Design a protein around this ligand. Structure first.
Ligand SMILES: O=C(NCCN1CCOCC1)Nc1nc2ccc(Sc3nnc4ccc(-c5ccc(F)cc5)nn34)cc2s1
Length: 240
């Protein structure tokens, strides 16, 4: 009854103020907002408040989604930059995992970049089959876990290192499961350091309990990230 008051605010998505905002178009809605509001992490997209239209108000993200940022030819990411985006995502997913939150649709298109170029994992909560991002077991059961978020994460790093290339462009979505089960993974991007590809393959472990945790991923990617100085510019493949 009064439990939603901290979430509520008075005076398709629209621009807004109060902070620059995205403002999107009953009992479930009140409860969900309260769950969503109690998530707070620098790498997870905030719920600012809810309003009656009804309205969901989120922070406006200056640079938009992460797949479009990296695809833009007038941006010049270095390997360091891109591993840095991956490290941020991993930190957001670590938080969501600690909250027992299974994202289910982790992808570069669903992460956003604010004005400080902080990546926020998004498209979850009220702010919400992606077969080419899905774990083998989830393609088989339509059941998702944190370890199946880990798989998606490994696809997301792939997207990172290719500057937003579509995964398995030659495989039709209806076919991905058969393709994978022949014994295949995504190939190593031209600008993907060997140590980061090893991580990708770990994230794609055939056994779900064997994939690293997001805590493990943060630690590991934080180390590899620190080895770079932003001297290597990542260019775009001609085949993708
Ligand atoms: O669009 C910009 N910035 C403009 C960036 N441009 C690019 C062109 O070059 C000029 C600079 N900021 C925004 N912030 C927000 C904040 C919240 C929301 S609702 C929401 N909730 N969860 C999600 C998750 C993903 C998406 C999404 C996906 C693809 C997209 F394409 C745009 C948005 N939305 N979403 C929309 C926006 S859009």
């Amino acid at each position: 009854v009064q439990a939603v008051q901290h979430v509520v605010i008075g005076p398709c998505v629209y621009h807004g103020t109060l902070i620059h905002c995205a403002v999107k178009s009953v009992s479930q809605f009140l409860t969900e907002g309260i769950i969503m509001k109690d998530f707070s992490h620098p790498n997870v997209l905030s719920l600012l408040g809810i309003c009656g239209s009804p309205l969901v108000v989120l922070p406006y993200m200056k640079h938009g989604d992460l797949r479009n940022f990296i695809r833009n030819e007038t941006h010049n990411p270095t390997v360091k930059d891109l591993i840095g985006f991956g490290l941020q995502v991993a930190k957001g997913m670590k938080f969501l995992a600690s909250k027992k939150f299974v994202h289910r649709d982790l992808a570069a298109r669903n992460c956003m970049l604010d004005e400080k170029f902080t990546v926020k994992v998004a498209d979850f909560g009220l702010a919400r089959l992606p077969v080419k991002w899905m774990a083998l077991e989830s393609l088989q059961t339509q059941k998702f876990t944190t370890k199946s978020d880990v798989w998606s994460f490994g696809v997301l790093l792939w997207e990172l290192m290719t500057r937003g290339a579509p995964p398995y462009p030659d495989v039709n979505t209806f076919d991905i499961t058969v393709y994978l089960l022949q014994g295949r993974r995504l190939l190593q991007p031209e600008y993907c350091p060997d140590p980061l590809y090893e991580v990708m393959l770990k994230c794609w472990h055939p056994k779900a309990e064997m994939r690293p945790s997001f805590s493990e991923l943060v630690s590991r990617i934080s180390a590899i990230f620190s080895t770079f100085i932003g001297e290597h510019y990542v260019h775009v493949n001609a085949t993708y």
